[PDB]
Amino acid sequence: MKTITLYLDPASLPALNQLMDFTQNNEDKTHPRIFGLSRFKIPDNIITQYQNIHFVELKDNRPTEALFTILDQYPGNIELNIHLNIAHSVQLIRPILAYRFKHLDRVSIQQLNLYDDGSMEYVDLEKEENKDISAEIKQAEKQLSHYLLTGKIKFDNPTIARYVWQSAFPVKYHFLSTDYFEKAEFLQPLKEYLAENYQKMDWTAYQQLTPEQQAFYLTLVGFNDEVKQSLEVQQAKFIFTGTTTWEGNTDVREYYAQQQLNLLNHFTQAEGDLFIGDHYKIYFKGHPRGGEINDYILNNAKNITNIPANISFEVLMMTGLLPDKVGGVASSLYFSLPKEKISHIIFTSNKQVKSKEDALNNPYVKVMRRLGIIDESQVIFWDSLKQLGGGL
């Protein structure tokens, strides 16, 4: 037969892992490949080095019907090697199972490789606490069997459904936090069920690639040499995480840029409440939607190195270029960070968070606290920091 590999992900983390898989197998120039990675545009000069390579858009977390046209180009017996985002696995595989159903004579599922979207999977599993996990699993398995047989979707428990693929196909899960599954008592039935089918996400694959492949990977993920060089200095590094705006009783964006600079001063100045130390080189990681606010912050922030709001903390870890310390305005991105690299996370005002107490009740913060990733003292509410000036 012929194996066709599909790489699907509307997010970032699974995509980064899938592009690494592609890189590791990049010596094979003809293996049929279908890319449905919404946030990554593979450069033209990489695509033209390969044959039987295809691209499909995702719509509402599903590859479009355009997928069928591509699969039709392979009239023989085909086996699908599928890579998916765990949280969105059910939707992503729908068109694939629909096609299989229509061509049960020549199409089969070879195996699945699933990767965490991020904090989402964990925040969702927390909501299943108190349920009979063993029973939830068994019911999901039965409903998946039906899904494979008719291509129809119907799960009593969408969250647990993300983890019962082994009941139908050979699978391998790559988790951001294996500790979560092994430490959460209520998930013991699921941990035991998954057995040998899961492993911790591998962040050192990049270190094992040939020099040529490392360069190839960086091009795939859009991490250019300029940014990389700025992150290889032989000095301690601190990255400040910017945000957009919050409930500050004003619609003036310049105010939010001003206050974010104030928050940064608490890390960079000895007079700050969160002073990280004079020996740190400072970097700014603006929010992807920060827009002109990022320009304001960079312009008024003395001696600071910008990290394209484009680059993600996930790619920094994948490449082993994550700075020594990360701090600033809170974001679910902090969930993926190693405990030792987290300094202080600052929460801004919104509908759900109006105090430090509310911040400690944030969905991902609750998981992090449980796992001992952070202490309550590392969670700060923005209004508690006084106005501070910068330096020369």
Side-chain angles (χ1 to χ4, degrees), residues 204-288 290-301 303-312:
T204 68
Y206 180 80
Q207 304 302 312
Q208 315 309 312
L209 300 172
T210 59
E212 290 68 33
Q213 291 176 312
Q214 297 184 320
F216 187 89
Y217 187 68
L218 295 180
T219 300
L220 286 181
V221 302
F223 191 174
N224 73 198
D225 200 56
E226 175 159 35
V227 184
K228 184 167 181 291
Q229 290 187 60
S230 65
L231 286 162
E232 300 183 308
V233 186
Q234 288 294 72
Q235 178 179 1
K237 308 172 198 61
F238 167 83
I239 296 188
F240 179 89
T241 53
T243 190
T244 52
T245 66
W246 57 90
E247 186 45 89
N249 288 150
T250 180
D251 57 41
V252 180
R253 288 172 63 78
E254 290 88 344
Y255 168 82
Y256 298 100
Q258 177 193 72
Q259 290 307 301
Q260 289 190 240
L261 280 166
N262 188 247
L263 297 180
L264 177 60
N265 290 342
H266 275 279
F267 284 101
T268 72
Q269 305 305 295
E271 299 89 314
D273 295 348
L274 317 174
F275 184 53
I276 65 177
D278 288 344
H279 54 292
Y280 279 81
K281 178 179 176 62
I282 313 302
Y283 295 77
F284 176 65
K285 166 57 64 55
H287 187 289
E292 100 283 9
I293 279 179
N294 292 342
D295 301 313
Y296 291 159
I297 297 173
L298 283 183
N299 171 62
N300 291 289
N303 51 282
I304 189 165
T305 300
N306 185 246
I307 298 180
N310 302 306
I311 290 186
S312 69

Side-chain angles (χ1 to χ4, degrees), residues 118-129:
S119 61
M120 192 190 330
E121 283 91 344
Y122 299 87
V123 163
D124 291 343
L125 281 165
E126 285 290 283
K127 304 176 186 176
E128 304 305 314
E129 187 171 57

Side-chain angles (χ1 to χ4, degrees), residues 12-13 117-120 123 176 203 239-243 285-288 309 311-317 322-323 325-339 341-342 344-345 347 362 364-365 368 373:
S12 299
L13 188 53
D117 178 284
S119 61
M120 192 190 330
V123 163
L176 196 49
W203 307 94
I239 296 188
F240 179 89
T241 53
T243 190
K285 166 57 64 55
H287 187 289
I311 290 186
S312 69
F313 277 89
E314 294 90 303
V315 72
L316 291 176
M317 285 175 67
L322 189 60
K325 295 296 180 180
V326 185
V329 181
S331 160
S332 55
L333 77 80
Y334 277 93
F335 180 79
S336 307
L337 296 178
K339 158 176 155 49
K341 299 181 181 301
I342 302 174
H344 289 90
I345 59 180
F347 285 79
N362 164 283
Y364 66 79
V365 175
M368 295 175 74
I373 297 178

Side-chain angles (χ1 to χ4, degrees), residues 93-146:
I93 205 173
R94 196 180 195 296
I96 297 175
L97 296 184
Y99 190 83
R100 189 196 76 77
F101 179 71
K102 188 179 183 62
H103 304 76
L104 300 175
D105 60 73
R106 77 176 216 288
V107 184
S108 64
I109 303 304
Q110 179 180 287
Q111 60 177 299
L112 305 186
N113 263 281
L114 302 90
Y115 313 83
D116 277 324
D117 178 284
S119 61
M120 192 190 330
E121 283 91 344
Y122 299 87
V123 163
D124 291 343
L125 281 165
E126 285 290 283
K127 304 176 186 176
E128 304 305 314
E129 187 171 57
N130 280 164
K131 291 183 178 179
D132 184 315
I133 305 301
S134 171
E136 298 295 320
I137 291 173
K138 297 179 185 302
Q139 185 61 285
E141 292 186 305
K142 297 185 179 64
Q143 301 182 306
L144 167 56
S145 179
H146 186 293

Side-chain angles (χ1 to χ4, degrees), residues 172-184 186-212:
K172 178 153 290 300
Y173 294 88
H174 300 77
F175 299 146
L176 196 49
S177 176
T178 49
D179 286 319
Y180 178 78
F181 286 92
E182 284 151 35
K183 291 189 176 184
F186 79 94
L187 287 177
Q188 190 180 307
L190 181 61
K191 186 195 65 59
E192 289 170 46
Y193 169 78
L194 289 175
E196 302 276 309
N197 298 320
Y198 76 82
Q199 64 181 63
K200 189 174 186 179
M201 206 166 261
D202 180 38
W203 307 94
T204 68
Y206 180 80
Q207 304 302 312
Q208 315 309 312
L209 300 172
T210 59
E212 290 68 33

